[PDB]
Write a protein that binds this DNA or RNA. Structure first.
Lengths: 200, 63
RNA sequence: AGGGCACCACCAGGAGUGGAGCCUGCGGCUUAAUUUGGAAACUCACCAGGUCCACACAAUAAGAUUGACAGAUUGAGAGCUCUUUCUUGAUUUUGUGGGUGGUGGGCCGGUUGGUGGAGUGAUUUGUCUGCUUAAUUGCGAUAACGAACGACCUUAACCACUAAUAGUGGUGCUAGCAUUUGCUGGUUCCACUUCUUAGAGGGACUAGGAAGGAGGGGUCCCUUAGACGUUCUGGGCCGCACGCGCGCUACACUGACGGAGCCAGCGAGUCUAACCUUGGCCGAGAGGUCUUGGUAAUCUUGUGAAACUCCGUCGUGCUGGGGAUAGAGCAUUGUAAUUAUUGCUCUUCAACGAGGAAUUCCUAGUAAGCGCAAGUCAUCAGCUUGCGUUGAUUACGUCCCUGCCCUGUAC
């Protein structure tokens, strides 16, 4: 019967939120009990209010609600740009990096949606052990995230990158120049700033 | 606003060379609204110039 | 210059508008703002006042930092601030150096050639002397012959076939009146399809007749710390000497008021939950309250609409015409009705006596009179679209006015 309060919580655009919205994470059935309130009908401000309150099931919540709202805002918004509170929720979310990559990083794999996701994912640091795992999993326009993950500056990572041999793809490879199969890469480029810079 | 009104009759120009005029004061912080020959944009700047007479100084012999 | 066409042109006329009160759109004025060109919050874009929030160098930390009971601070407040003090771990903090960009300034909505003839050429013929049409729509003629875009599809109206949630008749039971055995009704089955229905099939070619039709040009540079922000409370968009325009209500007897009679068509409706609401009860009224049918040809709903018809009062007096402005009280929607959403009751009783110069629409189920449904929508219409009810006068023409179209000269 708590949905009788949730039907009002959809307007909680300012001030103190209802107590039912603050205590919900304490219940082990919340993965089903949250379906009765259905915050995806709620105002965007609650999405950030929830994203600060939901912080391994956070990947299931981050993938089950956060990624669902992110697609609806970017796809439904009249300018294609996410709402400020949606963006603030995503950039404020991902406080555990595996929840971001496992929740949205891989499942999010048009090009405009990829660009907006990167503009948040480049806005904060990430652990070296976390960043290397994402670069390997990406080694399987999705390279626009690879170009972003390469912009932050292991032997298995170098071995996965060597197999990676539009102007955004050339420039992303050009950034890889910042650091016998290297003869094959030069043979591919011979098929010039990278051929000269590849001589270093 | 009292300043905005006092100068109202002086013409305005953009550094992109367009010309315009004050309509009226808006609000209390000295905003005003104006009209121009064509489509301005946020990269433009609006200016007005004021002039004063200069007179020559005298001179002295030297050694 | 001729010639042709059109009630966004006229002629013959109808209803008017322009004059009064009020509603509403624009301009101007005023103001802190009256944003820009079916607004009480939000919408919102405007005004007054408040919170809150990159990258690259030097210092810092195992405690950089993150989250949270109960209470609190302002005109506007909260575990991002504060009293109390837990939880947590490198996700990062303070100065100093260029900013780069979820940042500004890729895609759409009546018209000519071939081959042949003439000329040094640009041109020309074909595309014509004569006769036809809305039209390059056609006879004929003959240095031409043969070719290319623009200009079929649904209504009205008659009939076989469907089906029933629509209708008729009969049958059983039954009420009243009258008593040849009738007439007007109520409530269990049966037959039918004419009326209705809706879907499907067929039904003018210039031939008297349903009908000699109606409709489908736009979307490289600069600038960046709280930066072309986030959010809360209150106000405005409705202010009015005035100018221009679309409208509503009237100036009464071809009427106002009272009682009685009494008839439509097109719509729209809830379980996602609370929409359209019958019936009973209370109240002068607005309205309230207990139940009920309908996800609909089935229920609201025969939407028992208004004008209209009949019988009375009034007697030509700004009158019992007209109802602006204003006072007091009772309800309903909403978080909130003050500058006042809307409804009801009593009181107040303004201009207006058929409107100058100008000016709009209109040829038959049409103009005009009258009302209803839908849209928007918590509430709020004098608005827009559609539907039905009652139903005229005057042409069946022309180029006078307004406007459009077609067919001497190097300008």
């Amino acid at each position: 019967a708590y949905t009788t309060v949730g039907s009002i919580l959809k307007t909680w655009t300012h001030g103190k939120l209802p107590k039912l919205f603050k205590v919900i994470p304490s219940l082990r059935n919340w993965q089903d009990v949250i379906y009765v309130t259905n915050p995806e009908e709620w105002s965007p401000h609650v999405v950030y209010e929830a994203t600060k309150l939901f912080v391994k099931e956070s990947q299931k919540f981050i993938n089950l609600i956060l990624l669902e709202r992110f697609r609806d805002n970017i796809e439904t918004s009249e300018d294609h740009s996410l709402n400020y509170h949606i963006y603030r929720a995503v950039k404020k979310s991902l406080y555990k990096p595996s929840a971001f990559f496992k929740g949205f990083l891989f499942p999010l794999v048009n090009v405009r949606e990829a660009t907006i996701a990167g503009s948040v994912l480049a806005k904060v640091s990430v652990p070296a052990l976390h960043s290397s795992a994402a670069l390997s999993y990406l080694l399987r326009p999705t390279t626009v995230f690879i170009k972003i993950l390469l912009d932050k500056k292991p032997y298995q990572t170098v071995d996965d990158c060597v197999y990676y041999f539009p102007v955004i793809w050339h420039k992303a490879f050009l950034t890889f120049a910042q650091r016998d199969q290297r003869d094959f890469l030069l043979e591919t480029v011979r098929q010039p700033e990278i051929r000269r810079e590849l001589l270093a | 606003p009292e300043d905005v009104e006092w100068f109202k009759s002086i013409p305005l120009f953009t550094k992109s060379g367009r010309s315009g005029f004050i309509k009226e004061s808006l609000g209390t912080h000295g905003y005003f609204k104006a009209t121009f020959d064509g489509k301005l944009s946020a990269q433009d700047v609006v200016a007005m110039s004021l002039y004063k007479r200069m007179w020559p100084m005298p001179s002295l012999p030297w050694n």
